[PDB]
């Protein structure tokens, strides 16, 4: 079926197989799911339906859509542009790491499976040469699994602080260059979709996830991992970090408030069904994130079983858990390098698809906002090449010895946290109060046939902005500092630059409001009347 195959190619992504188990391990195992389902009910469905309906209603780019819907709140589109730019800066480095693993994978003995190399330290141990072995005192002397040492000391060569940026890893630089040039090739030759290439490269991530889950539940000691994954602690629910990360993981994994969802709705015709597509896409995305959660947490439950250390500190708990649990799982497969290279090719494919659609949405939005310059002299591909070069040069700062901390900061503060919370707050406030929920419900009725069931309407009015403003205020008053490996206690200037770029991603709405008020002034009530009124026939 063409409908089933095309939809399944958009459910899976890196936000389900890499970011969700990271956020479910860093912010407590089972305590992460309680705000996850709450935001899935109250902010995934309503904001997803809102953005899909608005994108299909206006049927154009994602930043002029807000121009023709509500010209006062046009800064929401520019905030999504900044979020997309930050994402395209650091969404490609995961493909660089996955290429680097693919470089080392083609060997009859895996690099991350034995306890002797140029990078392994003295405190390593095989953890497989004997059943009882000689641990529980080597564990007291900080025993380390070989994959945990391999990642830290060869993949990125971690340094003891963000102030200790070491030499640039040249192999990783070549990996990033290869990722950017294959993304540019996908931009030029590869836009012509369908054929025999979609029947293979769409069900392959689900087959690989299914076989990885089937293996992961078979690993001994996975019962403790699943119990840690599911049984929650309320003391771990007391901090606002879990709530913030759950809500913005909901917003990130659904592409909500990124900016490409308004462009996705514009691709569909005016009479496409928003409600059913939104419901099934959101539910299937939550389900596949949940399944990848089972897989990674079962694997690290086995890791904690084979060590003497408990489940809470057995992996990095930074954004490399998918690069630690998954390389551990593929070692237990018979014919391990085959499954390893197929898995890393899966990661390359499902990261490249999202990067391609993100950069395509960004370039089509920036040439729609500048129509008379980039559509007359054959320079759209030149703009794409210049943007790729610029994001490669700005992206290389995270590939150094200490650049992992910079990547962690921008992952937690660019397409996450306060940026997504503020954009969703102002989006839902705009729709439910400025444009009017009755007018938008009438527009949805004209589009798809039936109005929203008024639960989504009340979510737009009082539920979603209320809960997101509550989470924002709760994060702001009970501030908890960010730690990389759960104990780092970042320097003050690192928090300064993180908050600076998080503000710069979300101060573009009040700045645009201020300059729109200043540019066209007719005193306050006439200004708000002429800015509240929508433009043309939309």
């Amino acid at each position: 079926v063409e409908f089933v195959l095309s939809v399944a190619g958009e459910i899976i992504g890196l936000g389900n197989v890499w970011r969700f188990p990271y956020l479910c391990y860093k912010n407590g195992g089972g305590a992460f799911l309680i705000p996850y389902v709450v935001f899935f009910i109250c902010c995934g469905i309503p904001v997803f339906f809102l953005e899909t309906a608005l994108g299909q209603f206006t049927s154009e780019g994602g930043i002029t859509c807000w121009r023709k819907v509500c010209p006062l709140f046009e800064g929401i589109g520019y905030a999504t542009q900044v979020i997309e730019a930050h994402l395209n800066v650091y969404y490609i480095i995961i493909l660089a790491w996955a290429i680097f693993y693919l470089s080392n994978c083609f060997t009859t003995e895996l690099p991350w499976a034995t306890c002797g190399h140029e990078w392994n330290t003295e405190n390593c141990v095989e953890f497989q040469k004997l059943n009882v072995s000689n641990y529980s005192h080597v564990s007291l002397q900080n025993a380390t699994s070989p994959v945990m040492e391999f990642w830290e000391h060869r993949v990125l060569a971690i340094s003891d602080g963000i102030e200790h940026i070491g030499n640039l890893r040249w192999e990783l630089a070549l990996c990033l260059l290869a990722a950017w040039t294959i993304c540019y090739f996908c931009i030029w030759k590869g836009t012509k979709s369908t054929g025999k290439v979609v029947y293979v490269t769409a069900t392959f991530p689900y087959i690989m996830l299914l076989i990885l889950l089937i293996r992961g539940v078979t690993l001994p000691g996975a019962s403790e991992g699943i119990k840690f994954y599911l049984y929650p602690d309320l003391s771990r629910l007391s901090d606002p970090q879990v709530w913030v990360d759950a809500g913005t993981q909901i917003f990130f994994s659904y592409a909500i408030c990124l900016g490409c969802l308004t462009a996705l709705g514009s691709y569909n015709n005016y009479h496409n069904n928003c409600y059913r597509d939104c419901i099934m896409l959101c539910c299937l995305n939550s389900g596949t994130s949940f399944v990848a959660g089972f897989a990674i947490f079962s694997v690290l439950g086995f890791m904690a079983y084979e060590q003497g250390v408990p489940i809470a500190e057995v992996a990095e708990s930074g954004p490399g858990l998918a690069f630690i649990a998954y390389p551990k799982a593929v070692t237990m497969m018979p014919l391990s390098p085959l499954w390893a290279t197929l898995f890393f090719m899966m990661l390359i494919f499902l990261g490249l698809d999202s990067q391609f659609v993100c950069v395509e949405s960004l370039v089509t939005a920036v040439v729609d906002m500048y129509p008379k310059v980039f559509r007359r002299g054959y320079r759209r591909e030149l703009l794409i090449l210049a943007l790729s070069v610029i994001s490669y040069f700005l992206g290389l700062v995270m590939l150094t010895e200490g650049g992992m901390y910079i990547f962690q900061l921008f992952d937690s503060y660019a397409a996450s946290g306060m940026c997504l919370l503020f954009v969703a707050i102002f989006e839902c406030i705009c729709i439910g109060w400025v444009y009017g929920s009755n007018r938008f419900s009438e527009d949805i009725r004209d589009m798809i046939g039936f109005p929203p069931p008024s639960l989504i309407k009340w979510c737009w009015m009082i539920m979603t902005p209320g809960i997101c403003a509550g989470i924002f205020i709760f994060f702001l008053i009970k501030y908890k500092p960010l730690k990389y490996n759960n104990i780092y206690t970042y320097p003050a200037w690192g928090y300064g630059i993180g908050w600076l770029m998080a503000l710069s991603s979300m101060l573009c709405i009040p700045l645009w409001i201020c300059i729109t008020v200043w540019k066209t002034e007719g005193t306050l009530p006439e200004k708000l009347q002429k800015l509240t009124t929508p433009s043309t026939d939309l």
Partner: antibody
Framework: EVQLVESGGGLVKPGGSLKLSCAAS????????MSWVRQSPEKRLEWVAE????????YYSDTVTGRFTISRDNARNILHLEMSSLRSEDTAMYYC????????????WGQGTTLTVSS | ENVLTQSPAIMSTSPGEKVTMTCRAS???????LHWYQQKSGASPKLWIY???NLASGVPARFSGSGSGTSYSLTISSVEAEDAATYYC?????????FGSGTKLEMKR
């Protein structure tokens, strides 16, 4: 429970005009769209006009477009249908149907006001 | 103008007998947009079957719509004296809205 009582209608000259009125009660009139469905004396049913729940999405059939206009009033819960240049072909009995969900149809219909155009 | 037609225009059924009407559409229509109405002799039509599968409030379960695409049908298990009326078929997919010619359910004795 829900009563779609209607008014207006009668005998009008050809080329004249008339103003039909639909009174809706027992439900939120501003939250459901409306339509006028006429019935020919040959018992042939056809749709005439449709106004949305807000009042800015208005559609007409190809046989009465241009000459027929449909109004609304969400305050007093009333509906209107004003026609111009009535011929002998659009004499019928007009119903006041209620259809908002397009997967539900005109679920609640009216009573019917007889309209006669003749010389 | 999705010109809907119905055959036969006139039919007569004895009570407790199999009967199946039809509504042939000129163009393709959605399976969840075609509806069926019932108008008694000298009364306003009421909603009977919506989205060609379901039944409205008060409709007995012996009515059952079927069909998809362009050919649609309305099936009745056992008719009685309480449902001798005229039935029309509508569509909301394309504008302008159209109705069927109308099948008259008659009785014989």
């Amino acid at each position: 429970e829900v009563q779609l009582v209607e008014s207006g209608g009668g005998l009008v000259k050809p080329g004249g005009s008339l103003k039909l009125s639909c009174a809706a009660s027992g439900f939120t009139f501003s939250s459901y769209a409306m339509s006028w469905v006429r019935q020919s004396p040959e018992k042939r049913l056809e749709w005439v006009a449709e106004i949305s729940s807000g009042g800015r999405y208005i559609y007409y059939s190809d046989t009465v477009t241009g000459r027929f206009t449909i109004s609304r009033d969400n305050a007093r819960n009333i509906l209107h249908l004003e026609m111009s240049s009535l011929r002998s072909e659009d004499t019928a009995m007009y119903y006041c149907a209620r259809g908002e969900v397009r997967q539900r149809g005109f679920d609640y219909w009216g009573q019917g006001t007889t309209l006669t155009v003749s010389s | 103008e999705n010109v809907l037609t119905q055959s036969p225009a006139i039919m007569s059924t004895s009570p407790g007998e199999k009967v199946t009407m039809t509504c042939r559409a000129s163009s393709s229509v959605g399976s969840s947009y075609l509806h069926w109405y019932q108008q008694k002799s000298g009364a306003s039509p009421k909603l009977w079957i919506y989205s060609t599968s379901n039944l409205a409030s008060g409709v007995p379960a012996r009515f059952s719509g079927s069909g998809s695409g362009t050919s649609y049908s309305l099936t009745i298990s056992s008719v009685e004296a309480e449902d001798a009326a005229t039935y029309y078929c509508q569509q909301f997919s394309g504008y302008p809205l159209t109705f069927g010619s109308g099948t008259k359910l008659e009785m014989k004795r």
